[model samples]
Target: SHMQTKIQKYAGTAMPYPNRTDSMTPFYINHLGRHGARFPTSRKALDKVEKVLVSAQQENGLTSEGMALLSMIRRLSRLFDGQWGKLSKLGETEQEGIAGRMIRNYPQLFSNSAKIEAIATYVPRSINSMDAFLSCMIRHNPALQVQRSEGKQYNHILRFFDLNKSYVNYKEKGDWLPIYKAFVHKKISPVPIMKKFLLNPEQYLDKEAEEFVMALFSVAAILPDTSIPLNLEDLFTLDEWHRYWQTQNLWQYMSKSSAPVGKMLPVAIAWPLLSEFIRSAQEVISGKSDYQANFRFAHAETVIPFVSLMGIEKTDVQVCRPDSVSVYWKDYEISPMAANVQWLFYRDRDQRIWVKILLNEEAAALPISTACFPYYSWEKTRIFFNQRIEMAKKTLSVFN
Candidate 1:
């Protein structure tokens, strides 16, 4: 299950939970996590490949390679037998690992019987991830109480977009789609790869079918939990592998990466959520809230935008130039399955409030100017992000 899939192996990396230095008491943790890998969300995606493979193979003498590709795809199909886009076993373990590390790192914060509140999206994977996350925390710290709530119900802060007016308008004219397609072509300089399938060039494969297969292969490649016996990558040469992975990079970049031209799109989209986190952290600074932590489950759509909006190290780069798709704002780094960001707030006896920001559980320093690398004073943090709040306001003013 580890070495798996085509286009790219199901891959991602997040750091272990960070350890706090002396005299810091963690009172709250705010989390925003992208959902973990699961089965292909739809048969329609895979069926696209099926149509081309079945149609073309029948038109020619399907060689063993062609037969094998077709066969493995069919084999992989059984994984989604009953599940579709839900958490895989790996997804469950991902949550367990993340939650276990959270408790172990900050035992004081998740005290026995401490009240913690959680929020997740309407999506099933998120709902289950929150379940796994809280279950682990509570099991470790008995009486670590949690009141999990779905974001859509009454939680005004957690949002889910479904064709909202401005968003719809933005998508219609946005650079997201065109740039995405451009990168697709850029990444996919098709190699004559059907021979790798043990077929003569004309007998079983063509360029059109190859690209079509890549599309569905890309779609099917991210399933993390299934015991997929066949790996599509095993057939590609190093150069082919390079292009193959780039195909996935293109997909993730368009769908999730914040291209410089539309990096503001995410910055704009996530303004409200960003503001809410900042607002709540500001509230906590004033000692006004009782909740110990807040967690939100979302997709890479949420993760990418939120990170860019929050101003992580180099995510704010302008990568709109030709062949300039990315430098620091990479897909695997930012929005891999189960990608997450955490804001951990620590207070000292002096009543000075400081927060540490983490990406995938690693101590990624905040964008704020800080005397302490990872630990930033609340006032300065607010002042820095307050500027972001203003930036979002002015950017929105342009369309007005």
Candidate 2:
């Protein structure tokens, strides 16, 4: 009789028998004597029953405290003459206005290489081919020219260093401080190897340009043997250099979930070590200790929509062909232990996504005059992608 009364109060009068919809609803019920079932008469049994019933009620799309909270909110809103509703409306409008301002002032706020989704909303007249689209883009925007100019500078720097033995040793010795200091001096000359080449980059063709850039980046691949003195016998060959660059493991130091120390320490330490090595190399090669300006030209041949439109085989190297590229640059302070620089880049494919980097002084060294071409090989592509992902996870995690 008690179970029947309790069930009738909560289960409503519509259904006398248990229904699928009512299975999770909280209500007292008769315990069929089979199994370990027991009636909810005892204090402990009553408490357990209540807990289970509350959980059941939640599963039936009924919040346990819904009656109390909803009643209170409704009463409060009415007391304020609907002020709460008005506040909610105002909050939404404010958020929308802020988003609109960000969208409208995007180009002014962001660098040339920066691309935002709202700015990309403007769809231009459809072009017939990818090549045509790329040409139109480059002709209309000076940023494309900036990218090419940087690429040219990158190659020249590489060529200069390859020809100079003394400059090579400067990098090998890890004497970056003097090199950086020289860059600051007016009397200091450009590295003998890079000086003339940088002054006249126009003389080189596309292949020459590609090779030159590759050589400059090649230096980073060469690891010094501490036991050997700075001599020709100890120097690394081009083949060895390529292997080192390809195989050397550079990852986001902070990404290892099980690091012994705090996540930030490894990233903090690795970046400075890298920067010191890079700065020393640059100073030796440039004959200027303070040569802070370095350029990077990254190339890839993924079957992007723009590339496919041109009808060019994805494997082919398309040199000096403008293909919806973006560019950005910045300047910042550098310290012996640590420093930072900001750079940006974007491409036609997924143009809405902006790739930004806050490079430590040493990380800045890695980008200087690096280039990847043909971009077809799996090994080359995989290495670059992995490195970027690893760095991104570590760097972004810091902010999180």
Candidate 3:
């Protein structure tokens, strides 16, 4: 697919599932999810852009080129209507794809007639996401036994850290602010769209307009499908898109990956769930539990922090106040719509437990010392994850 057709980092898990085979027999799965691409649930972000476009119109700041862009925004805005922030056909299909891949990747893991245990956040989208995933499981294995639970009963896991005081305070007043403040000024440094399309560039070249443009661009960027073909593609240069995405990359990092205490706290926030997953699977392995799999459907809120906690991929590197373009901690790689992380448990005839971690169905080599590629020793994994817990409880400082 061309650049425009490809989903951005904020959209779906655009990468294909791993086709490679590891002959280990999997007995259990621990899954965490980010809800799929959907409407905004709230019209506020688009509404803000609508106001920005209106302000430019009144100031006579836009050219004919921009007038067409404005019209496109209006059309895009209509897609939200009352359906704001619900899973789309794109999301439902993505769930099916993930489900099918999981089944194919570990066929015996589900078809063995063992019980599959699943939970979701109270939100309607999350509930539907879990259902969408199961629908695919039953499609392939009609006799698959699944037990589902959700809402207030599972609030601690599903809505982890949403109301945590420490995390909240750190996010608002932490050290990340200064670095982000420095990063944004450089990022929004005199974007060309204002100069190229405005009658009076000064009116729209300021921070407010720049941020508005970035926000609108995000609306376009995260879209699962665009039937109207908005000029959002024509609105910015490749260089501008690069700059804006890096800015977003940093922003998400501060909130989910690196930087201050705000971003690094998700691991701690996710502890109960992580503990439960490890303990639960061990219980199954030890024959203390009947559940063979632990499936959780939550939000991007879970995926980002969990990945960061595990020190998987780009997350191990500390990226702060980026002086140049960077791809070290890409947002799409971590938390695209329908994003998920699964830790599958496998055991050899010798009773050696090997854990394989998959992020978006792609086998992610465990960040700890492992005996082999992709598959890790459960003993080393326990030590590694315990270390992650301590990492989350402490303060973080991102170096310049």
Candidate 4:
């Protein structure tokens, strides 16, 4: 019943990564990871919930559970005071864990000569994520040197949606809005929750039903990201949780993924990032680069589109109906908090380079066909990815 896109914790697969052939040796890693979980970016959600609670309290309309929930909200407000959108303590540990696993799984890839370069957006959470990840890597192997960069200079690739006026306008007032609204209206109703929380339900229900319920659900979704061990899921029915989550799923799919509503624009905007990954990999494969690993800390906006641009399995599926979204695109799985996409470059003794992709630390497939399964010949992979870059360029140029 849990479907938290931004607050879902990083979950690495338990299965061991596939073994490489004796002739294959890992050389470089290209990674793009979302920043870890943080407080809600704005206090409006908490404020909205608080408004409803205070209204109920003043009217003597709150039940015991409602009072308890209000008390929890007050505690959270104090905990998150002046810290909206900042990474939680758990976020730091998650990054460290991911770094530790990377080093352990590919011990040979972190050699002394294997330099590292990491970059992040100017956002504090992402910068902190970079710090947490790099700090762990250094702890594992102190001899390794890393070059780091951060700021708006990386926005063209890391936050392209902000740079593109057309895409930004579409996001605010797009054709998909009506479709999303209709689906939400059809699938979700706050009547039940209103009745449960407030004794004088009808008095206030008609007034702030949508906003209050959405704020409440959002609060519930983010609880897992905080240090608080308490669960608020009891406030929501399982069916209610699923429906609300489906709405979130559709919003992400239509706005960020390769869904038809965006007409490939979402995926196209990620061209610059894909180009960077391709170029970096080529440099390593051609033995022209000193860096052994390049990690970019970005957002779900970056991770989701880049995943679709590369045509990673199931990510690129085109869906128009909102109901079909959850069937195809699961945001919690595709771009959960601290979500990461990694490209591991391997070379055979013959100097032939092969590439493997890992999504959230699990082996994943790209659209390019290869008999080698997870390992695709770098020569063929380069051609396929460059072709996608060309297509992306053409698609993005339309609004220019």
Whose lDDT is greatest here? 4
- Candidates' TM-scores? 0.86, 0.15, 0.87, 0.92
270-368 per-residue lDDT for model 2 (tens digits): 222223323443343345632212222111100111111111221112222111110110001111001112222222243221222322211122221
The candidates, ranked best first by TM-score, are 4, 3, 1, 2
- Put down candidate 4 lDDT per residue, 107-194, tens digits, no spaces: 8889665689999999999999999999999988888988999999999989998988878988899888988888778777888997
Model 2 C-alpha lDDT versus the unseen true structure:
0.24
For model 1, residues 43-158, the per-residue Cα lDDT tens digits are 77666666666765787745677787778667666766678777777777777888887877778888867778778888888888888888888789878767888856723334
* Winner by TM-score: 4
Candidates' C-alpha lDDT = 0.65, 0.24, 0.68, 0.81
lDDT string for model 3 (272-380, tens) is: 6666677887798889987767788888767776777776867645654365325566676777777788888888788888888888777786556765778888888
Q: State model 4's lDDT.
A: 0.81
Q: Each candidate: RMSD to true structure?
A: 4.1, 34.7, 3.9, 4.1
Better of 1 and 4 by TM-score: 4
Candidate 3: stretches off by over 4 Å: 1-23, 58-60, 225-231, 260-263, 320-325, 390-400
State, as a TM-score between 0 and 1, how close model 3 is to the true structure: 0.87
